[PDB]
């Protein structure tokens, strides 16, 4: 690769609720699974996240 990218926190990390993660994934998968696509093994990563979203949709309250 050779050119690293610099990352700066603009905010301190925030813990998100189980209901936020659940809405984030819906929106993130749907966006990234949308045509006008990019497979590049993201196809399998998404498959994984779908597995994660299901787990959460089952978590209590």
């Amino acid at each position: 690769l050779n050119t690293p990218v610099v990352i700066h926190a603009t905010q301190l990390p925030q813990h998100v609720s189980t209901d936020e993660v659940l809405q984030f994934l819906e929106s993130f998968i749907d966006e990234k699974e949308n045509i006008i696509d990019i497979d590049t093994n993201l196809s399998s990563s998404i498959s994984q996240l779908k597995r994660i979203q299901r787990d959460f949709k089952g978590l209590p309250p």
Binding site: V5, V6, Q11, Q14, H15, V16, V21
Partner: peptide, 26 residues
């Protein structure tokens, strides 16, 4: 560690955090 708070009625420690970041990309 932003320490993960173990909480509520699940006794499980929430580990998902939202992190804004600004990056200089090639």
């Amino acid at each position: 560690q932003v320490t993960n708070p173990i909480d509520e009625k699940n006794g499980t420690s929430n580990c998902i955090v939202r992190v804004p970041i600004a990056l200089y990309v090639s």
